[PDB]
C-alpha cells in the first residue's frame, strides 16, 4: 500500500447490546457501541416468526361459537 494517501486504519473495539465484543480495524478511531450483531440479530428465529399469515376459518370460528 502507499504511505500517506489512505486513511488511518486502526484496531478498535466494538461492543454490542448482546454483550458481544469484537476488535476490528476501522477508520472510526474511537470505540464503538453497537445495536445488533450477527449473534443477536433475529434472522434465525424472529424473521421466521415474522411471516404470520393467519387463518380465515380460524378467525371465523374464533369470533364466536355456533
Amino acid at each position: 500500500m502507499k504511505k500517506d494517501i489512505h486513511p488511518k486504519y486502526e484496531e478498535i473495539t466494538a461492543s454490542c447490546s448482546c454483550g458481544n465484543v469484537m476488535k476490528i480495524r476501522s477508520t472510526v478511531g474511537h470505540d464503538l457501541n453497537l445495536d445488533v450483531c450477527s449473534k443477536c440479530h433475529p434472522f434465525f428465529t424472529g424473521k421466521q416468526r415474522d411471516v404470520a399469515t393467519g387463518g380465515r376459518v380460524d378467525r371465523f370460528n374464533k369470533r364466536f361459537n355456533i
Binding site: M1, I5, I24, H41, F43
Partner: protein, 177 residues
C-alpha cells in the same frame, strides 16, 4: 485475518470433505472484493464524486480509484473520459477484515433485513450484491451525511461452479436466505 484463519482451519476441511477434492488447492478461495459506486450524477459537479470517494474511503481504508467512461453515450450525456464512478479493490487482510465487518455489523444494520439471494452468483461462483444505503456501515456518521448513496459489492472467488461459492459463503455463515 480472523476469518482467514477460520478459512484455513475449518472451511478447507469442510469443503474437502463435502466435495471429495483430490487436492487442497482444488478448494475454492476468495480472491478479491470490489466496491463500486456508479455515480452518474457527478456530471453536475465533481464534489458529489469527491464526497462519494471520501465516504467509501472510510468504509475500506483505501483511496478509491475514480473510474471513467469507457466510451461515450448520449442517453446519459457522457463523453469518453468523464469521471463517472469510483471503485475499490480489496485483497488480502484488508479484504478479510472488511468481510468480517460486513457480515457481522453491516448486514444486521440493514433496515428490514430478511436475507440475501442465492441467485446472484453469475454462473461461475462470483457473488455480487448491492446495498441501497451507506449508513449501515458504522464508519459513516449519520449527521455527517451529504446524500444517501448506494454501492455494490462483488466478491470474486476461485470457485469454478456456482455452488462451490455458495458452499464457501455458507461456510462463512453468509446470510443467504
Amino acid at each position: 485475518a480472523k476469518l482467514h484463519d477460520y478459512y484455513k482451519d475449518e472451511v478447507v476441511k469442510k469443503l474437502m470433505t463435502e466435495f471429495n477434492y483430490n487436492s487442497v488447492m482444488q478448494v475454492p478461495r476468495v480472491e478479491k472484493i470490489t466496491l463500486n459506486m456508479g455515480v452518474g450524477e457527478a456530471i453536475a459537479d465533481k464534489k458529489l464524486l469527491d464526497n462519494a470517494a471520501a465516504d467509501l474511503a472510510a468504509i475500506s481504508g483505501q483511496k478509491p480509484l475514480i473510474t471513467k467512461a469507457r466510451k461515450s453515450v448520449a442517453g446519459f450525456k457522457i463523453r469518453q473520459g468523464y469521471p463517472i464512478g469510483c471503485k475499490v479493490t480489496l485483497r488480502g487482510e484488508r479484504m478479510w477484515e472488511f468481510f468480517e465487518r460486513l457480515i457481522t455489523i453491516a448486514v444486521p444494520r440493514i433496515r428490514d433485513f430478511r436475507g440475501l439471494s442465492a441467485k446472484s452468483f453469475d454462473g461461475r461462483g462470483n457473488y455480487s450484491m448491492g446495498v441501497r444505503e451507506q449508513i449501515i456501515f458504522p464508519e459513516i456518521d449519520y449527521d455527517k451525511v451529504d446524500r444517501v448513496r448506494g454501492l455494490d459489492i462483488t466478491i470474486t472467488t476461485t470457485a469454478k461452479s456456482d455452488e462451490e461459492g455458495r458452499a464457501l459463503l455458507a461456510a462463512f455463515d453468509f446470510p443467504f436466505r
